[PDB]
Write a protein that binds this ligand. Structure first.
Ligand SMILES: Cc1cc(C)c(C)c(S(=O)(=O)Nc2ccc(N3CC[C@H](C(=O)O)C3)c3ccccc23)c1C
Length: 290
């Protein structure tokens, strides 16, 4: 359910199919069952000890193709299993989980930028569209806090976004929440305690290192200790009350750089480095493969 940091897919010269797990308890990396198709700018989530890869795109030399797929990886069997496909392909996707259901936010398909949202029901192996986001959003940040889905930043088609909105599943509607202090396309969005962190990204001109959090109670975005490196198209996850950023693009290189955020000590620290440097990775935390 939650023990190893899994890094699914990514990109470096082409869309990677790598599935490496990191043990923060001994700094080790474990290469596992490669993804059936390589994918990049996909989402990674965990539902009931099972790891899911949602969306992305296969930027290959033989031709680039956005994904509608939702694969499943099992730490016990160390196997990938193709599950029910989402109505649409969604590259630079956003995913969150509310009450054991995967929500698939925005993402792009060819020139189209999606405003749409779809909900996977693992018990039935079905995908059903729900009300769409108020804005079209790619490279969107998605986080669930208090059984509410939040879509942070992204790119509408014309503008890079600082805006964010919340989804209330019962009413099946989206309302805008306080906008960020910074414009963030290709952010790294997660939830730690009661705050929603939006780290790095691209403000239209440069890769960001700034990390700002949204406090739900107070409804205000606030800056915190910046990251060591500037990153857009980065991996983010929370493990044992510490935010972990994974790779991404700095403006010059596709980083191998993995940083941990101690919110208690308000500090970012170089924790390891992924085998290969890469961007657009899918990242989730679940049980070891034993
Ligand atoms: C540098 C770069 C160039 C190429 C050719 C590709 C293919 C990749 S990628 O695989 O990682 N995909 C992604 C490219 C660009 C992204 N955002 C970030 C900022 C950028 C913008 O508004 O300018 C759009 C992404 C966001 C989330 C996930 C994957 C993203 C990368 C990062």
């Amino acid at each position: 359910v939650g023990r190893l940091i899994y890094t699914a897919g990514g990109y470096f010269r082409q869309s990677l199919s790598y599935l490496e797990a990191y043990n923060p308890s001994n700094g080790s990396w474990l290469r596992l069952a490669d993804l059936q198709v390589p994918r990049s700018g996909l989402a990674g989530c965990v539902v009931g000890g099972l790891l899911y890869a949602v969306g992305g795109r296969n930027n290959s030399p033989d031709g680039n193709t956005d994904s509608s797929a939702l694969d499943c990886y099992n730490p016990m069997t160390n196997q990938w299993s193709p599950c029910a496909s989402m109505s649409v392909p969604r590259n630079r996707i956003g995913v969150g989980v509310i009450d054991g259901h995967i929500y698939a936010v925005g993402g792009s398909h060819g020139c189209i930028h999606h405003s749409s949202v779809e909900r996977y029901e693992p018990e039935r192996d079905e995908w059903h569209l729900v009300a769409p986001m108020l804005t079209r959003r790619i490279g969107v940040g998605v986080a669930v806090l208090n059984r509410l889905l939040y879509a942070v930043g992204g790119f509408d088609g014309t503008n890079r976004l600082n805006s964010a909105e919340c989804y209330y599943p019962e009413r099946n509607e989206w309302r805008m929440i306080t906008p960020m202090n910074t414009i963030r396309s290709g952010a790294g969005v997660c939830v730690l305690h009661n705050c929603i962190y939006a780290a790095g990204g691209y403000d239209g001109q440069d890769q960001l290192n700034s990390v700002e959090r949204y406090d739900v109670e107070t409804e205000t975005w606030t800056f915190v200790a910046p990251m060591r490196h500037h990153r857009s198209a980065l991996g983010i996850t929370v493990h044992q009350g510490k935010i972990y950023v994974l790779g991404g693009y700095d403006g010059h290189t596709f980083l191998d750089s993995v940083e941990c955020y101690d919110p208690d000590s308000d500090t970012w620290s170089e924790v390891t480095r992924m085998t290969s440097g890469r961007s657009g990775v899918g990242v989730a935390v679940t049980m070891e493969p034993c």
